Amino acid sequence: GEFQRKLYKELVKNYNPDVIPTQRDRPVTVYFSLSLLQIMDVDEKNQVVDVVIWLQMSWTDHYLQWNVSEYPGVKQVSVPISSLWKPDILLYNAIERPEVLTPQLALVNSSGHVQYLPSIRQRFSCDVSGVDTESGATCKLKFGSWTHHSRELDLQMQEADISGYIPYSRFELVGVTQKRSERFYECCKEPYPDVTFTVTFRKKG
Amino acid sequence: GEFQRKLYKELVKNYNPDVIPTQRDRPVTVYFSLSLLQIMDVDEKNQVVDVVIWLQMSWTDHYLQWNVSEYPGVKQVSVPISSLWKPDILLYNAIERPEVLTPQLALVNSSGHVQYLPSIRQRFSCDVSGVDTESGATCKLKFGSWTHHSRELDLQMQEADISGYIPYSRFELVGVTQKRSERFYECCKEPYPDVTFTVTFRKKG
Amino acid sequence: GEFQRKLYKELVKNYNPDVIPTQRDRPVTVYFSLSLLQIMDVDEKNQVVDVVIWLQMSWTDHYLQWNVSEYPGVKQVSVPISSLWKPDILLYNAIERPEVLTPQLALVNSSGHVQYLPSIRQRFSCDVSGVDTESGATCKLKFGSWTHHSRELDLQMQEADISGYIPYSRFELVGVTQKRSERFYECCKEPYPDVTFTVTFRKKG
Amino acid sequence: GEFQRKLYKELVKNYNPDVIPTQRDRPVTVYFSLSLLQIMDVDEKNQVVDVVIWLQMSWTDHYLQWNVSEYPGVKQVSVPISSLWKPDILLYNAIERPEVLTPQLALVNSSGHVQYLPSIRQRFSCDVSGVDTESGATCKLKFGSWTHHSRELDLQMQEADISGYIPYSRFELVGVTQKRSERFYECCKEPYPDVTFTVTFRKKG
Amino acid sequence: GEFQRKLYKELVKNYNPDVIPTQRDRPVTVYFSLSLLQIMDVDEKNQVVDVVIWLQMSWTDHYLQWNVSEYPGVKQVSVPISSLWKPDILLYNAIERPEVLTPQLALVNSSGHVQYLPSIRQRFSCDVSGVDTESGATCKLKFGSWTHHSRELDLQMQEADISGYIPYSRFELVGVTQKRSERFYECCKEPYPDVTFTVTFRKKG
Ligand SMILES: *[C@@H]1O[C@H](CO)[C@@H](O[C@@H]2O[C@H](CO)[C@@H](O[C@@H]3O[C@H](CO[C@H]4O[C@H](CO)[C@@H](O)[C@H](O)[C@@H]4O)[C@@H](O)[C@H](O[C@H]4O[C@H](CO)[C@@H](O)[C@H](O)[C@@H]4O)[C@@H]3O)[C@H](O)[C@H]2NC(C)=O)[C@H](O)[C@H]1NC(C)=O
Ligand SMILES: *[C@@H]1O[C@H](CO)[C@@H](O[C@@H]2O[C@H](CO)[C@@H](O[C@@H]3O[C@H](CO)[C@@H](O)[C@H](O)[C@@H]3O)[C@H](O)[C@H]2NC(C)=O)[C@H](O)[C@H]1NC(C)=O
Ligand SMILES: *[C@@H]1O[C@H](CO)[C@@H](O[C@@H]2O[C@H](CO)[C@@H](O[C@@H]3O[C@H](CO)[C@@H](O)[C@H](O)[C@@H]3O)[C@H](O)[C@H]2NC(C)=O)[C@H](O)[C@H]1NC(C)=O
Ligand SMILES: *[C@@H]1O[C@H](CO)[C@@H](O[C@@H]2O[C@H](CO)[C@@H](O)[C@H](O)[C@H]2NC(C)=O)[C@H](O)[C@H]1NC(C)=O
Ligand SMILES: *[C@@H]1O[C@H](CO)[C@@H](O[C@@H]2O[C@H](CO)[C@@H](O)[C@H](O)[C@H]2NC(C)=O)[C@H](O)[C@H]1NC(C)=O
Ligand SMILES: CN1[C@@H](CC(=O)c2ccccc2)CCC[C@H]1C[C@H](O)c1ccccc1
Ligand SMILES: CN1[C@@H](CC(=O)c2ccccc2)CCC[C@H]1C[C@H](O)c1ccccc1
Ligand SMILES: CN1[C@@H](CC(=O)c2ccccc2)CCC[C@H]1C[C@H](O)c1ccccc1
Ligand SMILES: CN1[C@@H](CC(=O)c2ccccc2)CCC[C@H]1C[C@H](O)c1ccccc1
Ligand SMILES: CN1[C@@H](CC(=O)c2ccccc2)CCC[C@H]1C[C@H](O)c1ccccc1
Ligand SMILES: O=C(NCCCO)c1cc(Br)c(Br)[nH]1
Ligand SMILES: O=C(NCCCO)c1cc(Br)c(Br)[nH]1
Ligand SMILES: O=C(NCCCO)c1cc(Br)c(Br)[nH]1
Ligand SMILES: O=C(NCCCO)c1cc(Br)c(Br)[nH]1
Ligand SMILES: O=C(NCCCO)c1cc(Br)c(Br)[nH]1
Ligand SMILES: O=C(NCCCO)c1cc(Br)c(Br)[nH]1
Ligand SMILES: O=C(NCCCO)c1cc(Br)c(Br)[nH]1
Ligand SMILES: O=C(NCCCO)c1cc(Br)c(Br)[nH]1
Ligand SMILES: O=C(NCCCO)c1cc(Br)c(Br)[nH]1
Ligand SMILES: O=C(NCCCO)c1cc(Br)c(Br)[nH]1
């Protein structure tokens, strides 16, 4: 569409994806949740879990807003995430890079709200010695910004999902809880928030 | 050809491959089909299937059309798919990224119709516990746009293929059916279409 | 050389490597041959062969010619293949992308004749159930353009090679024959050519 | 922030990340330390250790400083490490490239001090034949600049860490020492510094 | 340094890394040597050797020289090898691409002499059936330009190294010799030089 093309032309003009879109010392609030689509494997010897997780991230970037009357009909645009600022959220437990299974695209609406929903295949470290018991194994998946404290990037939780779990995998999901925290570290004056998912599962065997 | 060179020079001038080529709120219709060239492996423990599939996608991009009388002789051009908009179609069942086996080129004709026919090696999740039975295992391969609803991208089916199947693999293909759906999701007002291929196969023994 | 530098400066100026260098509806003739340097492995379970093959491709690109009297001393130049048009030749039997073992460079002479001789490590599909028999296994390696028909790209065969075969591998090469064909496909009006190498080999044990 | 955006615009203008930011023949001092987060595996046959290590590097780049009164509020910025000069520090014992697990971002303050803290998964060569003894196996992890001698890049040590070690891995960390050295090599007039970590560990079983 | 920054700015201005820096039909002399740091593995079944080798390459590029009085203090610069012309030297025996373990940087001095010293992990083909004998296995590692004959690129040998060999690997290095040759091939009028390293080794038991 013609108004879409003009809209994209304006991004490349003025926008720097390296700059976190804070304003007036207000943080950028990033909503974060997770759906555990699969447990692919559990390596009992090496204390590693292999999962597919669907992350849901959303935030407002004030630099991405436009006047709906100046680009009529254009309600949302699909945009390569590499051309936007994105949260530098890291899974602390990860022992390999993530493999992103989905197109690397974000949805952005007229008031600059961005939705980025990557599905990833990820291996991470966890004590899984309980996995063949009734109790199962319980792993923590701690997520947080690598470089931004609470006054720059305000990580916030949202309602999660057991409904995406693939029923035919050889592990059953006993449950998932989630918790947001602020911690300090000896380096830095300001607190860093994290959102941690506690996941309990066991072998169907 | 000299007219070919002038024709390509015009693409780089006006064209943004990030923008879906809708016009007048009309969707872009994308025709989608599949030929299952091979079942390479079936991992019974991890519930994974390894295939080579040949996808056939085609759509019209109105920005790619030209006057055949102004570029005489030039009936179709071979073009890197990376310089065109392409459908963000995803295999929902995939547990790894696809490996594209074919040149990343599309054919485009004078009225802007694009053919993109990648062959991919792909591993995906499926309940394969039936694979050593007469009934075999039946897997769904659901394909759909990750970011575009029906009013932007109208996914449509076409005539599929058993004729490419490699006869000497250790799995025999019992059959393939296909089905198009529109579904809604709790988020979004507009429906997303998918095309799903149901594939039944079994070990030869 | 100083004349070499001026010669390269002229490529970047006028040349588009995406455009097949046909002229006056005449095809570009591409000469194609192969030397099978090694059979690395044969996977009897998965019906896969692992080889190193040395391809020899050559064609004339009329846009790459220059006046030898205007660039004196410059008889041929070594050029990154990515900055030239190259044939989009594909091994139809391949089940993984190729791994190129050689510098990605082509030789080009003053009348625009290009030599490109990549050595590749490649795994491909083949019925190898005969490999521990006197008859051995016989595999077809079919090569062809993915996007260009006979009137654009005229694929032509040349004299091949058993002399590069590594004598100490655990497979012996019984023989190699080669054949050029034209086929039609239901889509397209024009025929596509291929060059197929039939390779027979067996386990030494 | 608006002052943040103007600040980044000035980097791209004047700055070359290939140039080591020495001044007045003074070296760039790079502070270096390590936290050994995990021993993932030990390959006794191939004499290889697989670890995750968290490196802490910091240096001053005089070209990155700014006036705090001219960019009010802007105390530190998060920046892609690829757009800054970075130390070419190498783990001498490495037998594969590193896999970086963290966002490739550095913190930079107003006086051009840069903090870069990558976590890496890395396999390296070590005599591990002692690993199931009380004494354990003792490995050297020698780190140093690949191309800069002491008068250009002054590598300096800092206080290290056993406290990050994951308690549930099947190896226990006995102890870590660290040592800085200057050596000469027959080639070169100037000495090269290194920082070496000696790490002792053993199988728990 | 300020003079360093101006020096780099001049490279990007005038220099093309695709052009071999011959002058007055004189070849570019490339000095080549090798230190075999490790034998990682020997695959007896597939006739493959896995090594880490440290290559030492040096040549003069007349386009890289500068006046020391015009860039005072600047004696050598560390430069990404991708921004310089480099020899297209190939290990003829290689069955996989190399993995470069070192920063991809070269040293260049004021008279345009370039030092490039990559350490690589490389698997290559060799008859290793002797590896469990007193005699051991003897492999040839033949290195040479892929596209340049002797009158363009004059490959020359230098004094090599057993002193880097890791003492704790399960193979002992019996010896390494080296030899330079000129050969002709039926295609081409001019001879191609190579430098071959003969390496003898055996399992320690
Ligand atoms: C951007 O970030 C950088 C790094 O954090 C900051 O630069 C540092 O600034 C601090 C504070 O000014 C410096 O700390 C001071 O350093 C003095 C010199 O230290 C060096 O030299 C001595 C030997 O003479 C060594 O022992 C020492 O390890 C260093 O090599 C010290 O003398 C100071 O110590 C005294 O004051 C402190 C504070 O009151 C007392 O607690 C001490 O007991 C002591 O009496 C002091 O530690 C530091 O050197 C700088 N680091 C670097 C790496 O350069 C920038 O300030 C920051 N920019 C902005 C705008 O904030
Ligand atoms: C650029 O390279 C090409 C390819 O190497 C050169 O063309 C080839 O030149 C050979 C040798 O001269 C030709 O063979 C000759 O054919 C005639 C009969 O037709 C015969 O009299 C000779 O004995 C010899 O066999 C060959 O046909 C030709 N091949 C192709 C594909 O064009 C070309 O000369 C080079 N250009 C320049 C400017 O050097
Ligand atoms: C940049 O580094 C290169 C390589 O170290 C330097 O070139 C080398 O310079 C030395 C001393 O000038 C040369 O030695 C001389 O060689 C000649 C001819 O063979 C001989 O007759 C003399 O007795 C003397 O030994 C050396 O050959 C030369 N090497 C190469 C490969 O060119 C260069 O000088 C350095 N430049 C600066 C400014 O540091
Ligand atoms: C852009 O998207 C956001 C998020 O979907 C919309 O903001 C929400 O608006 C609804 C009420 O209309 C409420 O759920 C919340 O108050 C908002 N959510 C958040 C996360 O801020 C916003 O309306 C959209 N803008 C437009 C113009 O459509
Ligand atoms: C470009 O290709 C498309 C698809 O092959 C052509 O559209 C078809 O036109 C024929 C008319 O003979 C119809 O019967 C088909 O049903 C059309 N298909 C679709 C999807 O539109 C188009 O005509 C071609 N353009 C040119 C100039 O040849
Ligand atoms: C179609 N898709 C979303 C696409 C979208 O709007 C989107 C994409 C990318 C970024 C931002 C938004 C909208 C909500 C449904 C979802 C698909 C399903 O939940 C799903 C996802 C992953 C595995 C299995 C099933
Ligand atoms: C030759 N090729 C197509 C090439 C083309 O025109 C094309 C390429 C790329 C984009 C658009 C069109 C046209 C239809 C036939 C096909 C070849 C065979 O079906 C095949 C496909 C996959 C594996 C094995 C064999
Ligand atoms: C030296 N080299 C070629 C290099 C060249 O001129 C060339 C390179 C790239 C493009 C165009 C031409 C020319 C023909 C001989 C060949 C060497 C041997 O046959 C060989 C090839 C592959 C594996 C093992 C041995
Ligand atoms: C939050 N994070 C650092 C982030 C930061 O300031 C930083 C990042 C990148 C560049 C420069 C600075 C500061 C120190 C604490 C650390 C987190 C924890 O110790 C940790 C590190 C590695 C693995 C597991 C856990
Ligand atoms: C410090 N380093 C070289 C670094 C340099 O100046 C250099 C780097 C890159 C390009 C040109 C020159 C110079 C010669 C010594 C070498 C280190 C040692 O041999 C070594 C190599 C590999 C494993 C263990 C030890
Ligand atoms: O340039 C953009 N917004 C500024 C408003 C100018 O009217 C913008 C945001 C997104 Br998402 C795109 Br595409 N462009
Ligand atoms: O590992 C992560 N960060 C590194 C990015 C590439 O260097 C990461 C990001 C997200 Br979202 C997850 Br889950 N992990
Ligand atoms: O997984 C797919 N897309 C990922 C994009 C890169 O992150 C994908 C596309 C198609 Br067609 C298939 Br099958 N999978
Ligand atoms: O720019 C193109 N066409 C529009 C102008 C008509 O003269 C165009 C289409 C394709 Br396909 C290429 Br390449 N360029
Ligand atoms: O798979 C092939 N082509 C895809 C595009 C580049 O990877 C291919 C080409 C050749 Br030659 C072989 Br063998 N495979
Ligand atoms: O510019 C080139 N050819 C056109 C002729 C201009 O007089 C050219 C061909 C090659 Br190969 C290079 Br490098 N440049
Ligand atoms: O095969 C080599 N080069 C191909 C192009 C770059 O990947 C090569 C060079 C050297 Br030195 C070795 Br060992 N292999
Ligand atoms: O440009 C920067 N600093 C110089 C000040 C000129 O106004 C600079 C440093 C960093 Br980190 C960024 Br982003 N910009
Ligand atoms: O610019 C450079 N040399 C061209 C001649 C001007 O004196 C040059 C060489 C190297 Br290494 C760099 Br960085 N720049
Ligand atoms: O090998 C290293 N550097 C080369 C650049 C590409 O990997 C390296 C750096 C560090 Br820190 C480690 Br550990 N390895």
Residue numbers in the entry:
A (entry chain A), B (entry chain E), C (entry chain D), D (entry chain B), E (entry chain C): 0 to 204
Article, verbatim:
To this end, we employed α7-AChBP, which is a previously designed chimera between the human α7 nAChR and the Lymnaea stagnalis AChBP and has 64% sequence identity with the α7 nAChR ligand-binding domain. In the present study, we expanded on these observations and engineered α7-AChBPVS, an α7-AChBP with additional humanizing mutations in one of the allosteric binding sites, known as the vestibule-binding site. The neurotransmitter-binding site is located in the ligand-binding domain at the interface between each of two subunits, whereas the channel gate is at a spatially distinct, yet conformationally coupled location in the pore domain. The vestibule-binding site is an intrasubunit site accessible from the receptor vestibule and located opposite to the neurotransmitter-binding site.
